[PDB]
Symmetry: C3
Subunit: 428 residues, 3 copies
Amino acid sequence: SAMSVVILAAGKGTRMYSDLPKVLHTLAGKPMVQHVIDAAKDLGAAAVHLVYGHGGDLLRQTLHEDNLNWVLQAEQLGTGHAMQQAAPFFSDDEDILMLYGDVPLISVETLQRLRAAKPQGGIGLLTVKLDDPTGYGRITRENGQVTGIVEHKDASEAQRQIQEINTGILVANGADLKRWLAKLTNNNAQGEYYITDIIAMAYQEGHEIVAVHPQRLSEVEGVNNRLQLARLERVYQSEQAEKLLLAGVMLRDPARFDLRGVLKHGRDVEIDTNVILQGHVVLGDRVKIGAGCVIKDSVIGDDCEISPYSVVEDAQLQAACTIGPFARLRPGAELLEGAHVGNFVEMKKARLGKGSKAGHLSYLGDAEIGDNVNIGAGTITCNKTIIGDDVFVGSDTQLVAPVSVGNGVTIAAGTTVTRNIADNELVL
Amino acid sequence: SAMSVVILAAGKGTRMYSDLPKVLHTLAGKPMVQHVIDAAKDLGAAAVHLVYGHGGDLLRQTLHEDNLNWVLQAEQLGTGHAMQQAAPFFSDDEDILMLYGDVPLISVETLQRLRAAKPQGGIGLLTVKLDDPTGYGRITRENGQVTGIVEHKDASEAQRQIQEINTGILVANGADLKRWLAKLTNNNAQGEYYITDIIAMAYQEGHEIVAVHPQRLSEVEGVNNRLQLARLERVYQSEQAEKLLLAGVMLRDPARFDLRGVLKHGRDVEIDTNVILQGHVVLGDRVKIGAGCVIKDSVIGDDCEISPYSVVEDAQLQAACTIGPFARLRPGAELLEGAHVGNFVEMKKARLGKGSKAGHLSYLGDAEIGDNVNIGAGTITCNKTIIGDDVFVGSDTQLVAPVSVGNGVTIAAGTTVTRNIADNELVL
Amino acid sequence: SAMSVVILAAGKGTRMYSDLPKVLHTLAGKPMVQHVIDAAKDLGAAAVHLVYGHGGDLLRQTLHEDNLNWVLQAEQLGTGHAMQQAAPFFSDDEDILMLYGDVPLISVETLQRLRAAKPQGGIGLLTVKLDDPTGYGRITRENGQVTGIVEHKDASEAQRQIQEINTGILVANGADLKRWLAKLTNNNAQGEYYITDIIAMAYQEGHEIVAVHPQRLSEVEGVNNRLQLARLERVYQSEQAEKLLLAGVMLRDPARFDLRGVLKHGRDVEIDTNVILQGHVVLGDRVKIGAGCVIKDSVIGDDCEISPYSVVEDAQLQAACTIGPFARLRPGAELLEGAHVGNFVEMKKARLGKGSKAGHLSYLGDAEIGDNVNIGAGTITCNKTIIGDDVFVGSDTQLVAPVSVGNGVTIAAGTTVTRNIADNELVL
């Protein structure tokens, strides 16, 4: 049926020691909470009620979704209190799913299982078994059926023996949640309203609670300091690296591979050590990536070979291109088939012709290069400048924009150019 | 006595998701099967019968050995079938060793032990003990003597308790193998001919089977997808790094060290993080390698210091040379004693004089530099060009090949050179 | 009370396979023994008696401390013999602490606990419990009180069952040590004098030995070959990385982070993969460090962003500066607020003006740049050269030191400059 998601970002992140609200800190180039939001959209949630208690300005500034509903928690009286703030927006028919902004790695597949498990008029609860539960609410089951959740402090000595604990993620009818949430109370040592209390309410009402379990423990792990964030970073990266390897993308060393975004890979792609991929990268068949490269929001043609320690940003490479080592492609760069970019060469808003080489110490700016052109070592453009097909450029040539150069033109070393040059005309 | 090796590359590598046959995929810069071939040559195998079922063109294209004998397996009817294809080439006197192209890390030392263990007219079989054998053929021993191998499917419940399993590597007389291989049959669920059946044949004939065990489990691990290949890559690299450390080569971080080839190291060599060595590298005493460097098929003199993020290919450095950071040496580069190559400097088919510096933004091409020369920042050569001893070159000087420059010549900044220059003559 | 430290560097480092004495080899940019010396100074040791048997010249050459007292051990007759050599310098009142130069990671906090534990006229001994003690002296306790140390060779079969072993670190009154050290003897298979014998002497005299335990086993681990050194390197680095993460410094990947020295970090600092920090680095609030950067003895202003694969040495950056990618800052470089250094740009003993850009292929040497200056791509200085505020420099301009350039000057591309330039004067 229909569903909505409640993401909780109310928890204050003092241990982060940051001015940025905890949930906005990045994991793999994307804020933690955005991982949770993206899961909610995949599941098809109609609305995403985000509950925050601090850093409102930064949260709205960073996060923009059409269905994003902002819910203030004036003071931090606990998970149960937070769900009360969002309860008015719950629709009676829709199932309401409860997620946390500091638990980025919850899997969409595990959430789909949780929804199926929800009995009607009942609750589906994500639970996990820990070799050592300590300070964790313990699932209490009689005759194999869930009856409630016992906080560790209130835990009896027998209940401190239960391996199963509470993740805090659950699913319930929207109307049911509004009924239980009204019954909540603050009479307890902390003074908080604990969401866990609704599980007992369901059992007392004769409704059933069904528990499912996550595939990995990482899915339910949450972040409270930079160290745990760095740990989940490595978990996420290694999870992606194994998938890519089994999909036929070779990684020389999976531990030294960072993917921040989405990769579309052809067959027989090879990626060496310490490569970082960012944004949306597209790699063709038989693409090679040298050690230490960084590629962001770029497309690489089939059979291109990027040599080591090259940096590419929003560039478009056709097939058979080669670049690097130490090449640098600014945004808007573009190479045609067979083009070579050499070491210590930069390109901004420029296009290099087919079979055109800029082998050394050359900067190209707001320029267009013809096919089969040869760019001299040390060539520099003070940007727009255009060059025709089959031009040769002398070593250390300077071209002052706007300069157009004719097809077949040949230019002498050391030349400095301020006028345009006729086709097939030698210039010195 | 005499020996030959049968390498099996018949297994088809669908899980690799590749056009390249599985056994050709690289581990540490060398195809897996080539690891096996190289082991066979160390052992002194007279012939290496490679049995393939697909990708013949690529295999012959890649692998060239004088003793390499190519054996087609028309269809993939199992290991026993494959050994039948090679059986005609077996010599009666020679012992025949059975290896696999997807098991790259089998150790030469473990294979030497296997040969000694072979009883005459009998079989030596490599076996290993696994905490969890599942789907593995189980060694069956009566009174401590081997009697056969039991596939897991046919395994009885007691036999599913045996820790010892079959590696698939074995040694037998060449004549014996031809006798057993004839007796093989396809009557079984798969329809394959299992090589494991010969072990029972030996026991029924009264001949003895003797089992040895590998030193590491990695030696017998085989590759069927990119992930397992990447795992063996890390195993191999870490095995080399420990050896180098105990041999007196310091590695700042062994996990971030990749050796693809053979290293000859002097004493007191230090290698920082994320260095990659390729081909055949020779390092002198007290050589330093900066973080991120890549060295291929190059020789570095005693006491040379390569600064970080330098790339060197087929270069020859004398003692006391320094290069980098961000230096780049194309093939054929050569430095004399005391020479310095600075950042953003490239050298192709060039030689730098003794105590000669090219500190900045300089490209050198098909050139020869005299001793004590100073190369200006921005110097560029449009290649052959020669420079005498004790020359000074102005910043941003261009030299058009072929230009010869006299000893003691001093050249002005911005100069562009098309003629030769007399000794001790200032030029502007 | 007062204290002194005895560091033992007598052990000869044959397994290191080095000409450099073992204790001088570096861990995190600092010689192992210097870790021990630095611990001793934190504890406030009045004197540090270093006992060496070889490589005296290199040790004095490398290690310079005001309180460093050098004690020769003519021949290597064991720890007890070494302490005899230093015993004359012990003061009666001062407690004497026994440390080892090959145990770099001993913690100052664990040593403070050891001192408190020392009974008067008695001994405090650092001990540890090992799942497998083998070849380790075993602590022998009767009624819970220490009575002696039993070498493993002399160990009885019951004593080979004791988990507690001897670290070799201990504390005793200076006078007491002189009394026990006199009683030592060489009558044993090795012929050595074992320091462990004094523990029994104390028990026989009725004095008490009190054992404390280290926090980590790494604190008491010692180095005898390059491999163990590399292991302690990784232990030390990962220990620092966790501290920085909990302190609010984000590390994208803690395993790929090396700190060699001391870091002062503002809030919300982010450090990407494979960064190396050296010497004394100071980072402001919200500083970003790109993948692969190296920073040494440098100060980075608030909000500076260092792009990847940049190398910085003894540079001083004000707030809001940006540099890289592929930027290189030689020692003495300095940037003013808002300055940008682009790719393939070097700076030595130079200062870049506020909001001043050197975007491409530019070398700056012994120069001073005015605010709002624009530095053309390919600009080169043959160093002192000065530039006024609001100057523009053409692409590939060369300036020959000493050249002063006026405020507001604008210079043409390809120009080469040997004279000074008047304010607001265009030059070509």
